[PDB]
Paper text:
IRE1 integrates multiple functional domains into a single ER-membrane-spanning protein. The lumenal domain senses unfolded proteins in the ER through indirect and direct mechanisms: as a result, it undergoes dimerization and subsequent oligomerization. The association of the lumenal domain promotes dimerization and oligomerization of the cytoplasmic kinase-RNase tandem domain. The cytoplasmic domain has been shown to self-associate via different surface contacts, where a back-to-back (B2B) configuration is believed to fulfill the essential structural requirements for RNase activation.
We determined the crystal structures of G-9807 and G-1749 in complex with IRE1-0P at about 2 Å resolution. The structures are shown in Fig. 2 together with the structures of AMG-18-bound-31 and apo IRE1, including the first reported crystal structure of human apo IRE1-3P. All structures show IRE1 as a B2B dimer, with extensive overlay of the RNase domains, but some differences in the kinase domains, especially in the conformation of the activation loop and αEF-αF loop. In IRE1 apo structures and IRE1 in complex with allosteric activators, D620 and E621 of one monomer form salt bridges with R627 and K706, respectively, of the second monomer, while in the AMG-18 structure D620 has flipped outward due to the helix unwinding, hindering hydrogen bond formation with K706 and interacting instead with the backbone of A701. IRE1-0P was predominantly monomeric up to a concentration of 30 µM, while phosphorylation partially stabilized the IRE1 dimer as expected, with a calculated dimerization Kd = 67 µM.
Residue numbers in the entry:
A (entry chain A), B (entry chain A): 562 to 886, 891 to 963
Amino acid sequence: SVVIVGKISFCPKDVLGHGAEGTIVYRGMFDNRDVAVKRILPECFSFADREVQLLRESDEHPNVIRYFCTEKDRQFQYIAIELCAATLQEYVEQKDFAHLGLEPITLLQQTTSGLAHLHSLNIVHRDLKPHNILISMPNAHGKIKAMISDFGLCKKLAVGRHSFSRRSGVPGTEGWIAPEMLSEDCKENPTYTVDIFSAGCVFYYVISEGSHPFGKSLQRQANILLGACSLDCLHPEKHEDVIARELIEKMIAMDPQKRPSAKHVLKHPFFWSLEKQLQFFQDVSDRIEKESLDGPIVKQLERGGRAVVKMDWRENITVPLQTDLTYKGGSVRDLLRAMRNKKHHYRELPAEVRETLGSLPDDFVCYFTSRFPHLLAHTYRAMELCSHERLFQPYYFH
Amino acid sequence: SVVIVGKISFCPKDVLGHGAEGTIVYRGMFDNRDVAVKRILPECFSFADREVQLLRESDEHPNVIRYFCTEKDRQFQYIAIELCAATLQEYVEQKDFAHLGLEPITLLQQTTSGLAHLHSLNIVHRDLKPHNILISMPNAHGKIKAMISDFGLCKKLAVGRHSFSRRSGVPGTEGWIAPEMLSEDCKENPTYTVDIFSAGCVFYYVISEGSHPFGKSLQRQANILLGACSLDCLHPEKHEDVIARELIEKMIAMDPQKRPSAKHVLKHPFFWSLEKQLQFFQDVSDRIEKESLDGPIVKQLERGGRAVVKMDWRENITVPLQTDLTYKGGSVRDLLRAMRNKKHHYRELPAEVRETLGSLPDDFVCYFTSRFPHLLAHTYRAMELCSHERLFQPYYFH
């Protein structure tokens, strides 16, 4: 039996999910389109009217769920939206990541894009979690994407307003709520960074493949208020986990002013390709070639640098490279200068030294980041002194 | 009096345009959304059903017009689509381009993106013209975009099929039809490149601010069959017009096999920023630094190079630069090598030589392209020998 309510037509046997306030999501059709149909009770005709309104004006972004139509009835209201393959929670729980490549990070970047779009419209989502981050059906080329959904808790801030009050509405979903939303003694109103806190937990939830920065369910919201978090799944001497830790640590910071904006997150090396990482290394190496060794930029770069280059980086690179090399082995700047030269003079390098480096640019940059897993993170943090310069606009945001 | 036909609700006093087969476009509403409403006669219930179907499956791209809904009536069918500010024709005719910057080129790039999206779905538009290229309403940040519309003439090719037949359907709109659609003696079926031909004319129509490669209305379709075209608005010694001419000439080529694909067009330096143009010059200069002077790549680059560098490029650059310079003045390769050095050693350059060059990277690259308006086009054509190499993937397509 296929219920029809105007242009929306769904079958009640095809249930897809349920939500708070006893709303049920069914599969259906709208205009020869396969859609997901939300059924709304008369006790949420405002929860729906606010969600549909904000969805109508932010669904322009490809990483915001596409809204089609709402048909009101005699006892109900219905919401037609884009039909998705799964939620992000079901994705992490049921997919083998060994066969997915960089896709989990792409979903995180797409989620951040849609979040930055909402923030650019003065809209704070306030309830970001894996459950309401949806995975699209594969398109004609077999590609999928993530999309923000569930706009029932989100607020539009007035133009000019930086923040909003705690007292209005439920604080969110337990276990993903920024601590400033619940802490008893909070002298500062919540702002757009509550979404960055939730996003930070989602980031760890995806790359840890199911864990939470603040522990298991029963504790995590109380750990959030205590600030008791741990990122154990990130190995401290693996280049990728070091990069992710640097980002995630800032996103879930207790101080909301320390959390990056969504536009800062989109610029973080957590999303850079190997090619872009090698370009960053070449860009700062060119930038500091004629910079004084006791100037501000070189000082910051060498600050704590001996641990980065592992006392003597000349003793930590393969023998074929050790040969053809004046370089201070404790200098981060001199390690980058070696990489700048080996990349530039790569075509003219001996075969066995091009061999151990690998192919430009992917294997070449992995040669160094795998041996010095803190080099990129340390350099990215130090070279923030030039984030305003035109040359580094690809790498920072301002 | 506001007519209501279900979810679609428009007012007949708010007419926006008319179309062939006596269809009229009105302003209206669909779901608290401002939309444009097409009214369809019973003699186009197939012209509509095919357009709505192809629009339903390609409106995912931001540069394809967004389709909302169709309500059928007792004597009519109605099409709800995104409400646009103007057509591209009205844009070229009524806007002062001095106050628009690079926007007309952005509209051309967005139009090409949406066209490449259609071609990637095996859909040939077959009727691309300024009239049915729509300009969006400005978004929340005041930005506009172009969108393809009018899918009534477009065909979905079966998977595998390279072409389609002339005999089916009207050939298009007179004055924008590829010559293979009308020429009496044509031994080769039309293919996706009919859209590239139309797009090429649209390109000239926008940058010439109203002219056509094939002359005025009464002649142009007959000039198309004769191949009698002229691009008079493109000055032969201005860097931008030389780049545009190189692209437009290939897009409107009589041989359809010589017309670039939409993905090739998107890669052409016609769309490169000044920064990207300077990066191309640096990339080929690095690429050919240790290449033999009598090797294939350097031979192609110097082929016809004396006219590019104007006999002696050392006599065509300002005096402050002439000083601090071993360089063969008839060599395109040596002109690029000079630019590679002045960019690399820019911070360490004398003040008056940094002055005449200008700021990196915009004024620096314009210093050379303005003095040698064929340098980029000639180098781009010659360096196609490396289009397959990873380093040049930003600049070509393959």
